[PDB]
Structures are given as C-alpha cells and as structure tokens.
C-alpha cells in the first residue's frame, strides 16, 4: 500500500481519473431494473394504433 498523492501541477496521465464501472447481473432473477418509458397524448374518436 504505497501513497497515492497528487498536486494540481501534475500533467496529463498524472491527473487522477475518478472511474465508475456500471456492471450488472442478469439472467438469475426476474428483471427489476429498466429504463424510462415514452408517454404520448391520447386521441379520441379516431381509430389509432
């Protein structure tokens, strides 16, 4: 465990990067996390899809 220290005068590459990995687990349970869903305006007296 060696020290991980920084100064603002450090160049590119020595500039720290905050990294988040959004890994996931699937295929072992019913789906519970989904994305947003589109919503539109309803229409009356016209046969629509």
């Amino acid at each position: 465990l060696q020290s991980y220290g920084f100064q603002p005068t450090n160049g590119v590459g020595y500039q720290p990067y905050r990294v988040v990995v959004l890994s996931f687990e699937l295929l072992h349970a019913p789906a519970t996390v989904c994305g947003p869903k589109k919503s539109t305006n309803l229409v009356k007296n016209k046969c629509v899809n």
Partner: protein, 46 residues
C-alpha cells in the same frame, strides 16, 4: 419468482366456526423474491 398476497376482512358477528358465506379476495402486492419458500411460522404480540 413472485409472491402473491391476497387479503379480505369480513365484519360478521359469528362466534367460533368459519362463516358459511362467500367473499372474494383482492390482491395487495405482487412482489419479486426469486427465492424458494418451504416453511411457515406466525408471530403474535405478547
């Protein structure tokens, strides 16, 4: 992988036996668990 719950309360003034009447059950919550269930035990306040 879903745990269905239904509940219904009847206000009937019968003493001991199960009432002889018809009443439906409405669904409360259909929640996912994905885990097998094999044993059952209840809890009462003391």
């Amino acid at each position: 992988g879903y745990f269905k719950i239904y509940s219904k309360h009847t206000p009937i003034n019968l003493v001991r036996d199960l009432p002889q009447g018809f009443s439906a059950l409405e669904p409360l919550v259909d929640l996912p668990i994905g885990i097998n269930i094999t044993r059952f035990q209840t809890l009462l306040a003391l």
